[PDB]
Ligand binder design. Structure first.
Ligand SMILES: Nc1ncnc2c1ncn2[C@@H]1O[C@H](COP(=O)(O)OP(=O)(O)OP(=O)(O)O)[C@@H](O)[C@H]1O
Lengths: 251, 212, 295, 108, 212, 109, 108
């Protein structure tokens, strides 16, 4: 780990619906009673103002300003990342997958002014809405995904797979991730030429290791090459997995 | 009465240096503090605060008359060239600097190089074990010109000391070349070289004769 | 009357605190800069008798990207234009896009009042730099910068004379706002003669739904008479003074003015307020000369 | 350039590449010693290195069968004659590195 | 008061050494870590990080008064020459090194050689089998001069110890020649040779007499 | 306290040997591994890697107390003379060798 | 140098090269023993090695028929007289290595 900290600002996206005119589906019921619209704010206030204290327990963070709109969770990023993606999972089951959610996690330095520390993390919220509505902004404004593709792909069978299929290689084995990240960025000007260079880095790691250890490294070469020539949005997913692994074990 | 002396020159880096920038977002291929670049493009640049914070320290140790302790309160003969928040005789700084941008990209791509910043492997020896803390740095490439312009202006009172002011500025330019300019420069990372040191006027109110 | 196009590169313009910064800056920054440098040249008494001549005025920093830009009208349009009525969620989500907008194009000054909403063009991104001090307990501070891109320039409109063109000739090589003792203010002055045939609606006589800019400031003889039935937004602009004979540098009093693009109804007058906290051998001048656009 | 180097190298004969990266540790390093010298000086001065670089390819085509099947297919001797400019010479240095990366991916 | 002493010399490598480089791309025929060079070109150069860390290690074992344990905390008589991040009396170092560049290319091409680096074949014997782990390294060519300049400067306080400062510097130069310089040099790869050891003044403030 | 002992000697080859050098390109008349020499000039030299790898092997079979199996892990009485990558008491070696260069060219021609 | 060495060597008579690389393991090593010594000393000192190097070519053209047909076509004896400078002598050493590479390219 590092001696830094992250700041997340989880805010509810859509709010004009389910309060003004969004319950209409049948001509029989009016779906416009004030009681039907008043229970919407009460049902969500229990999750964004009461359930936040229960879900933030046994963690190295502290919630600040736990309201029904925007929150302010500050603390170490060892538990904030595991709390932002987890809080949305409890909101989908509570709403049956009918209300989207967006936020943004951004690390900062120590002993920094809170003015720009809370303002830079807020600019990523507005930048995470250029596509449509169910998007997300990671550490920077370039990682524009759909959030749902993180816990189901990146956090599922991508970031977790490296923790047990690469942890055996240390010191000498950790001299290839820093270069593969640079190749993932230089793709517009260097398109076909960058593809030919990728086949060389996949063979340097397999040859520079133990013979008995080669049995573990047997499927990571094919999975890493397929994730480079398949989709433009898929190429940015490898930059996030390789960045979270370096911040895990280091120093 | 009021002139604008501009010291236009080209900083030639004869040795790759390393200056820690802000956060790690433009170069996350390292383990320590990377080099600051441009937020729009991807060109390694150097801020102008490193040129004033280093030249003033190396100059206030030979043209001083008292042991310093705090900035803006040592050697009044040179405090009027940088700044002072205590003396009423002068407040503004008559040496406006500028962020040196890398203008060597017009002929660098024709030769075909690696990229813009390399990675150097460094470690330490605890005198009890082998390799300890396999860290790494991010130095700068060799041979990269820059745009450095030092602005000098008089304020009427600057009359019977203009010729003496050029002696301090000219001596400070050649003194920076004999010292590192960056981080961890004790092993030989900085050492700049002011190429084509010339001075011209823009407003036109003072003749040029003390070129070199 | 005559615009002065100038572009910025890695500048700094704070608003409230030194660590924060904005893409633009208030109109009082330009007026408080030419007067401060006039004493260093040798004509401080010449510009004092020129700013108080009614016809002499300045404008705020307006963007210039292949065409002059103007601020959005505050409060306009009213509750009559819905722009493609489809659903209550689509109309409510697009109304905030116009609120976060900063400046409109010169050709959209008439189409915005009829019914058109769009996102503002990305001019530049807010980037910050870090500094510290090794020989002082290892302390550090954070400041923000403004790096323009996509050919983002500015322009200021003033009056043509044989004295103003020489005072601004040295400002491009002396810094303007922010950290001046580093190089956060150097620019290049692009002089021009013919402005534009459409941007000539600057008047100060008749009142036909005008719009005050450059932080207006009504006079004591005309405050509530022109404030009733109007659109404005109070801001904040203050800070420590900068003198050469005080040994303390007293704090300037607060002057909560307005914003660039406020729509009133009548025509103001424009005065010059003097900021004198305790005592000073000089006088802290201020702009406070709003213009008007016919819209 | 990089398009015809992914299908021509795979089209061979008998499987299991007998030639390894150990018996080709000279002709792949002498070409790298010319790319760095072409950007420092002109092309009319390095006329002696071009003549000696071509001999290394022909000398290896008679001592091992794993070399004749690579020069005639990839047209190594043909590219050594079309070059005549500084910009054209730099293209041959990048084309040689492409045939090495794909040679180790399918085998080794 | 304030002088600039530059120890201009020519390092003549009488034996090819090997220093662990960064990325293995200087030659597409290697298998291990090559030698770090230049990012723009491809000339075998030696960094200055291997000079300060090796000269102080081989010198702090004879000019000390206590058994060391951690760097930057042993032998106060020589801590002011290199640097110390713990003592409040001094922080900056008065011995600035420099990355030596290969300047022997002005006459090396006239003789006609193979290239700039060679590949040495090495292996090991497990005392139970034949050849084991057919690895290979990359050493440096013989007879290659370098530009080594040691920047020295005083800070007023350097008064009643200038004659003692040159005794440690002169002893450390001849002591480095009797030991390897680089990695895996136990078999005899380093062993430098300082040719034309001279010292001149650039600023002009201290007379030259203790040349040799 | 701290001394420097240099064993200066002259190795006289009474019998022609054969050490497999680098690539087989020093002559266009060979077909097998020749002898390593100089990359710049062309003088037959012997490296120092063959001296440490042979002197330590022939000496660790008479001044030992246990049957060896792997290098750098046999006979502690002589491990401090060469080096050990496992013992925490010492890491560097106190016997720095040197690549012997042929200096008989002053009278061979 | 290298352009005229690919067409003159192919133009022979009877096929199947009877001369192998085993019977020419002397004249190909003496030329390498002179190129490496020319970069250390001057040309006025190695005047005795040049005279002995020419005799080896004439001595081989009388004991085997596979040598007379190679000297008269490649003009080996003519190039040994035009040389007189250190830079010119280095060109003949590189020209001899080119004829060996193309010799095994067609046969062996
Ligand atoms: N917890 C809550 N319960 C009920 N109403 C709420 C709650 N939080 C916010 N609101 C309503 O939301 C309105 C403000 O919405 P806002 O304009 O911030 O949405 P928005 O930012 O435009 O959404 P989007 O970013 O999707 O465009 C307020 O008028 C308030 O009544």
């Amino acid at each position: 780990g590092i001696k830094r900290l992250a700041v997340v600002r989880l805010d509810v996206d859509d709010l004009g619906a389910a309060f003004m005119a969004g319950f209409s589906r049948q001509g029989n019921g009016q779906y416009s009673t004030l009681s039907r619209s008043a229970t919407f704010s009460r049902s969500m206030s229990l999750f964004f103002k009461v359930y936040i204290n229960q879900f933030a327990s046994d963690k190295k963070l502290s919630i600040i300003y736990a309201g029904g709109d925007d929150v302010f969770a500050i603390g170490s990023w060892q538990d904030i990342i595991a709390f932002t993606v987890e809080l949305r999972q409890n909101f989908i089951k509570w709403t049956n997958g009918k209300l989207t959610l967006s936020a943004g996690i951004g690390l900062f330095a120590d002993k920094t002014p809170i003015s720009l520390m809370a303002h830079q993390t807020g600019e990523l919220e507005e930048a995470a809405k250029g596509n449509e509505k169910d998007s997300i902004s990671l550490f920077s404004s370039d990682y524009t995904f759909k959030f749902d593709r993180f816990i189901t792909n990146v956090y599922d069978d991508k970031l977790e797979q490296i923790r047990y299929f690469f942890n055996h290689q240390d010191e000498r084995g950790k001299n290839f991730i820093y270069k593969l990240i640079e190749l993932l960025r230089n793709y517009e000007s260097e398109e076909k030429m960058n593809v030919a260079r990728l086949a060389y880095y996949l063979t340097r790691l397999e040859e520079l290791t133990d013979k008995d250890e080669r049995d573990k490294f047997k499927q990571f070469k094919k999975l890493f090459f397929k994730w480079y020539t398949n989709n433009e949005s898929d190429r940015k997913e490898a930059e996030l997995a390789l960045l979270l692994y370096v911040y895990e074990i280091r120093k | 009465t009021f002139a604008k002396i501009k010291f236009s020159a080209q900083i030639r880096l004869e040795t790759g240096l390393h200056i820690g920038g802000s956060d790690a977002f433009a170069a996350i291929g390292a383990i320590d503090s990377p080099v600051i670049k441009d937020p729009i493009t991807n060109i390694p640049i150097i801020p102008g605060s490193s040129l004033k914070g280093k030249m003033r320290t190396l100059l206030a140790k030979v043209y001083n008359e008292k042991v310093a302790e705090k900035p803006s309160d040592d050697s009044d003969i040179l405090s009027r060239l940088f700044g002072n928040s205590k003396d009423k005789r002068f407040k503004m700084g008559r040496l406006i600097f500028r962020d040196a941008f890398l203008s060597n990209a017009d002929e660098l791509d024709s030769l075909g190089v690696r990229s813009y910043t390399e990675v150097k492997f460094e470690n330490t020896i605890d005198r009890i074990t082998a390799e300890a803390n396999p860290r790494q740095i991010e130095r700068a490439i060799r041979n990269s010109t820059f745009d450095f312009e030092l602005i000098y202006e008089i304020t009427d009172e600057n009359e019977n000391q203009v010729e003496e002011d050029f002696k301090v500025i000219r001596d400070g330019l050649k003194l920076l070349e004999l010292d590192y300019l960056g981080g961890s420069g004790s092993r030989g990372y900085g050492k700049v070289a002011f190429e084509k040191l010339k001075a011209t006027t823009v407003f036109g109110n003072y003749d040029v004769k003390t070129l070199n | 009357y005559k615009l002065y196009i100038m572009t910025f590169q890695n500048a700094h313009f704070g608003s409230g605190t030194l660590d924060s910064s904005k893409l633009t800056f208030s109109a009082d920054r330009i007026f408080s800069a030419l007067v401060l440098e006039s004493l260093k040249m040798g004509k401080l008494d010449a510009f004092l008798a020129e700013a108080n001549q009614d016809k002499f005025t300045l404008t705020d920093a307006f963007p210039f990207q292949f065409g002059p830009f103007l601020p959005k009208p505050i409060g306009y349009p009213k509750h009559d234009q819905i722009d493609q009525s489809v659903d209550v969620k689509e109309v409510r989500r697009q109304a905030k896009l116009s609120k976060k907008l900063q400046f409109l194009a010169l050709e959209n000054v008439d189409d915005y009042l009829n019914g058109e909403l769009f996102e503002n063009e990305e001019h530049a991104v807010i980037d910050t730099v870090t500094k510290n001090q090794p020989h002082k307990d290892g302390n550090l501070y954070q400041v923000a910068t403004t790096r323009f891109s996509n050919d983002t320039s500015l322009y200021v409109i003033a009056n043509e004379s044989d004295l103003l063109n020489e005072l601004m000739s040295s400002l491009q090589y002396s810094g303007l706002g922010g950290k001046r003792s580093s190089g956060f203010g150097r620019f290049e002055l692009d002089i021009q003669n013919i402005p534009l045939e459409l941007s000539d609606r600057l008047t100060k006589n008749h009142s036909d739904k005008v719009m005050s800019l450059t932080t207006a400031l009504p006079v004591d003889a005309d405050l509530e008479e022109a404030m009733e039935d109007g659109h404005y937004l109070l801001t904040k602009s203050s800070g420590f003074a900068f003198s050469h004979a005080t040994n303390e540098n007293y704090r300037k009093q607060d002057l909560y003015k307005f914003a660039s693009g406020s729509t009133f109804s009548k025509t103001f007058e424009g005065q010059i307020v003097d900021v004198r906290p305790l005592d000073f051998p000089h006088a802290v001048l201020n702009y406070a000369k709003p213009l008007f656009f016919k819209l | 350039k990089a398009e015809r180097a992914i299908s021509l190298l795979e089209k061979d004969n008998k499987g299991n590449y007998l030639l390894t990266t150990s018996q080709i540790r000279k002709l792949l390093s002498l070409c790298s010693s010319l790319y760095d010298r072409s950007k420092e000086r002109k092309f009319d001065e390095l006329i002696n290195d071009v003549s000696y670089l071509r001999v290394q390819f022909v000398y290896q085509a008679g001592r091992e069968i794993a070399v004749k099947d690579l020069i005639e297919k990839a047209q190594i001797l043909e590219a050594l004659k079309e070059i005549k400019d500084r910009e054209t010479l730099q293209r041959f240095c990048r084309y040689m590195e492409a045939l090495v990366a794909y040679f180790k991916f399918y085998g080794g």
